[PDB]
């Protein structure tokens, strides 16, 4: 047979790369080591990211972008560090917060920029404490474990209700993926030939075998439901 | 070498007593000077494609006159 589409998508040709030069910049925390203060100077649109970003100016003259928090205005003053209080937009440390506090853009280590709860409308809560680490419940309902001194922002990422309006036509979804790396439109595998897909071929379009496949299948075969524990709607 | 928007077409015959018609190509108009975060160009400041070498003709006569009005300034002194 021939290489599948997902196998071509891994060579990273220009058809499958992200057009990142169109974004404001990486939206990460900077490496700072004090108790500073900042001012929001702008709220911008980041093309293919789903959440608006804020631009922050530190008292020592440092510029950086972080995902915007719902309810933060331009010209507002925020504090960064271990002594920061519990207010929207403040960058705090997770070791200092009580139980059930809603945060976002949570780091795993000290100084990685933020990993979890970054997409629009998402947030995390503080759910306990291990010996050396705090337990945080993510939006997937799973639990992750992070350092004592990992930074996070207080509040919820702006842009909720994003998905309550139907796109309503094939062209509204044509722009959406012009600024992203996602391949669109998507051809069903049953509509291909046997040389291009394990589902292709036959008089009647059908998945010829059960769709569930094991975790040990070689590349070029992991299609359908991957290592599923269950199927069906209920 | 056909049309390009980075040039405006002009044709001249009103103030005109000779008799012919042609077309002149000039570059689009400039704007008051640029980078951006504070975003307000000014009142009394001059921008021309060439420079008449002017000095006080292209700027007001206040303290920060050419820089900006008293808006984005007093946190600088």
């Amino acid at each position: 047979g021939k290489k599948l589409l997902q196998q071509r998508a891994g060579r990273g040709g220009i058809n499958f790369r992200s057009p990142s030069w169109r974004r404001v910049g990486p939206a990460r925390y900077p490496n700072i080591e004090g108790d500073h203060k900042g001012k929001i100077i702008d709220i911008l649109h980041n093309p293919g990211v789903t959440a608006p970003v804020v631009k922050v100016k530190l008292d020592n003259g440092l510029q950086f972008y972080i995902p915007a928090v719902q309810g933060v205005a331009v010209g507002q003053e925020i504090s960064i560090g271990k002594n920061a209080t519990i207010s929207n937009g403040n960058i705090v440390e997770v070791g200092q917060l009580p139980e059930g506090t809603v945060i976002c853009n949570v780091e795993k280590l000290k100084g990685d920029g933020g990993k979890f709860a970054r997409a629009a409308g998402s947030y995390a809560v503080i759910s306990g404490k291990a010996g050396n680490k705090v337990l945080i419940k993510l939006s997937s309902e799973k639990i992750v474990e992070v350092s004592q001194n990992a930074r996070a922002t207080v509040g919820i990422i702006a842009g909720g209700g994003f998905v309550e309006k139907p796109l309503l036509k094939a062209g509204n979804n044509y722009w959406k993926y012009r600024v992203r790396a996602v391949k669109w439109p998507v051809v069903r595998g049953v509509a291909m030939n046997a040389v291009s897909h394990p589902h292709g071929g036959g008089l009647h379009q059908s998945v010829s075998r059960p769709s569930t496949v094991s975790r040990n299948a070689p590349p070029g075969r992991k299609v359908g439901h991957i290592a599923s524990r269950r199927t069906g709607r209920r | 070498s056909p049309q390009q928007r980075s040039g405006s077409f002009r044709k001249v015959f009103v103030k005109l007593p000779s008799g012919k018609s042609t077309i002149h190509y000039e570059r689009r108009k400039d704007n008051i000077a640029r980078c951006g975060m504070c975003k307000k160009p000014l009142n009394g400041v001059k921008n021309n494609y060439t420079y008449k070498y002017s000095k006080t003709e292209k700027r007001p006569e206040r303290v920060y006159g050419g820089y900006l009005c008293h808006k984005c300034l007093e946190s600088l002194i």
Binding site: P52, V54, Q70, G71, V74, G159, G161, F162, E164, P166 | -
Partner: protein
């Protein structure tokens, strides 16, 4: 059909109804949190709003402030 009458007879009655209820929430008369309902608030992009009197810009939801 209200605001959704610009689609004609396409996309299905229930799909047009959901689109129309979201847009009718966006175009409600909103009140500015900072000054008051004095100047009306408008959307710049998804999650970005400002009031046209006080010129204050803030971050909110996708279709409401």
């Amino acid at each position: 059909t209200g605001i959704a009458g610009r689609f004609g007879a396409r996309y299905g009655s229930s799909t047009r109804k959901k689109w129309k209820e979201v847009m009718e929430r966006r175009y409600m008369p909103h009140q500015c949190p900072y000054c008051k309902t004095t100047g009306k608030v408008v959307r710049i992009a998804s999650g970005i709003w400002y009031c046209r009197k006080c010129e204050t810009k803030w971050a909110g939801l996708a279709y409401t402030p």
